[PDB]
Paper text:
MLLs degrade N-acyl-L-homoserine lactones (AHLs), molecules that are used in a microbial communication system called quorum sensing (QS) to coordinate a variety of behaviors, including virulence and biofilm formation. We provide the structural and biochemical analysis of the lactonase [name] (WP_017434252.1), isolated from the thermophilic bacteria [name]. [name] is a thermostable, highly proficient lactonase with broad substrate specificity (kcat/KM values range between 104 to 106 M–1 s–1) for substrates such as N-butyryl (C4) L-homoserine lactone (HSL) and N-decanoyl (C10)-HSL. The binuclear center, common to all MLLs, is coordinated by five histidine residues and two aspartic acid residues.
We solved the structure of [name] in complex with AHL-hydrolytic products bound to the active site through cocrystallization with C8-HSL. While the model of [name] in complex with the hydrolytic product of C8-HSL is limited in its accuracy by a relatively low ligand occupancy (∼0.7), it reveals that the negative charge of the hydrolytic product carboxylate group is stabilized by the bimetallic active site center, and that the alcohol group interacts with the α-metal (iron; 2.7 Å; monomer L). In addition, the carboxylate group of the C8-HSL product is positioned between the two metal cations, 2 Å from the cobalt cation and 2.8 Å from the iron cation (monomer L). The other oxygen atom of the carboxylate is hydrogen bonded to the hydroxyl group of Tyr223 (2.7 Å). During lactone hydrolysis, the protonation of the leaving alcoholate group may be an important, catalytically limiting step. The position of the alcohol group is 3.3 and 3.5 Å from Asp122 and Tyr223, respectively. This suggests that the side chains of Tyr223 and Asp122 are possible acid catalysts for the reaction, although a protonated Asp122 side chain (protonated in the first reaction step) would be expected to have a more favorable pKa to fulfill the role of an acid catalyst.
Numbering used by the authors:
A (entry chain F), B (entry chain X): 8 to 283
The structure:
């Protein structure tokens, strides 16, 4: 198999750096009212154009997220603002590659946060691969009518109305061979209820791990590890980063972080080419 | 048994409120450089004068913690400054009750942080009850020569030189009857590697849960729960708070928080009296 892997730029988000790096600048007797900063980072998605069928990793934010008529609650829009030109929307990035939503055989949802699961509703011809614990947690947010936080009610509403086809990865489930040189990694609980990664083996480029929010940035990754400011499972988070470090060492793979502005700058994006 | 329980005031600490309440005031598009606060809170200890023998819960900070010749690293003194008059030192609070260090039969160390294990070295005639996972973690900090952070090298150094007598609570160990109406609760990992609480049943006052840093304040406790800015085991922390809530409900017990300024103000301290 001679796949082509594309990095698609789906715009920029800002938030409190304390979300990204917990207690990054603690108050002191000399700086008792210490200030945070509002840091900018990329949202992106990965397309694997594979002869056995097209695989998409993450789906970015819904085009209807922001604004007075937006799906995102006003508090969410103010703490986690997303900025994107029309060329950044996932449907346009895919159209520029001559890829219609119906051509996607698999969507791997790293997790179901607003900045990863925003366009799942497009992929009505795919199998949506998601962690069972992540799916359960998001569906409880929906059933409880939660309007704030990182699980977007109107996104989930659209997944159910559009009759998406789900394959849940079970809590103790091995790492799933999707296609030649493409493996779903079950990271389990950490950043969210259930995290999935991807291990891709390309003939030219060699190994790539897509970590998504298992590892926000190179600063998260250290060593030593700098965890995020809120976390579902701190122990699982720390175990997941060290497991990724060991897999990268043993397989000589690059690690692609979820939201690293400096790493993302260096990628070849879908407007310039691809990785074989 | 007709015990007397004393609350001893061991002075005041300040730190970034984000340590106390994770992401208490997140940056927004309108407040992108949001300021934290440097909040003040009590350090205290509990003496149970029991006919079966005196039980101490926690030991506050070492009198030699602060200052240019202090045991605390300079970064620790600046992020977690302790202020205490000599009357606040545990040795003096106990002397004012005519209690010598040698009169303590049991010391329950909730955990081994700087603000709880600072005077263990005084209690050479006691059995020191500690969670096995907390002891292991602190002893690794000692062995790796760590000088910064919440585990004070020079305090651990004095515990070993003074030949303290340890009883470790094992990870799966039940809740230990120390004396009539005094039970050690094994909370397990959460805030730190291994947390112990106390459930005291007094004839007049009824039930008291000493939670220590399993629950910092009433704001932590909610509901809903507001976790602290850094945590060893987030899942264990959240389970521990709900377990304490259920025990309080099923036994009609008061919950005494680790560091709640408003609750502490309402306690009768060792200069005014005691609880029977
Ligand atoms: C009201 C509290 C909001 C919930 C905090 C978690 C939201 C979050 O972490 N959102 C994004 C930030 C970008 O990574 C994510 O983690 O994927
Ligand atoms: C160098 C970073 C310090 C480690 C952060 C945890 C220290 C901590 O939480 N210390 C005290 C704060 C007062 O409760 C404690 O939890 O007992
Ligand atoms: Co996320
Ligand atoms: Co503590
Ligand atoms: Fe994210
Ligand atoms: Fe404390």
């Amino acid at each position: 198999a001679r796949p082509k892997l594309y990095v698609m730029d789906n715009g920029r988000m800002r938030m409190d750096k304390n979300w990204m790096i917990a207690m990054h600048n603690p108050a002191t007797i000399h700086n008792p009212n210490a200030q945070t900063e509002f840091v900018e980072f990329p949202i992106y998605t990965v397309l694997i154009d594979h002869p056995e069928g097209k695989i998409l990793f993450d789906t970015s934010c819904n085009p209807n997220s922001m604004g007075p008529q937006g799906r995102w609650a006003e508090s969410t829009q103010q703490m986690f603002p997303w900025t994107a030109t029309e060329e950044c929307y996932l449907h346009n990035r895919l159209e520029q590659l001559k890829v219609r939503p119906e051509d996607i055989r698999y969507v791997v949802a790293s997790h179901l946060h607003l900045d990863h699961a925003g366009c799942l509703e497009m992929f009505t011809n795919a199998t949506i691969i998601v962690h069972e614990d992540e799916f359960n947690g998001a569906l409880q947010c929906y059933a409880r009518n939660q309007k704030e936080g990182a699980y977007i009610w109107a996104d989930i509403d659209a997944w159910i109305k559009n009759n998406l086809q789900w394959r849940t990865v079970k809590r103790h489930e091995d790492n799933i061979l999707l296609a030649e040189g493409v493996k779903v990694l079950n990271f389990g609980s950490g950043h969210a209820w259930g995290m999935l990664g991807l291990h891709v083996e390309l003939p030219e480029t060699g190994g790539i791990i897509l970590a998504s929010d298992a590892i926000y940035t190179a600063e998260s990754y250290g060593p030593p590890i700098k965890p995020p400011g809120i976390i579902y499972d701190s122990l699982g988070y720390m175990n997941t980063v060290e497991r990724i470090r060991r897999i990268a060492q043993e397989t000589k793979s690059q690690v692609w972080f979820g939201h690293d502005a400096e790493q993302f700058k260096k990628f070849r994006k879908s407007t310039e080419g691809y990785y074989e």
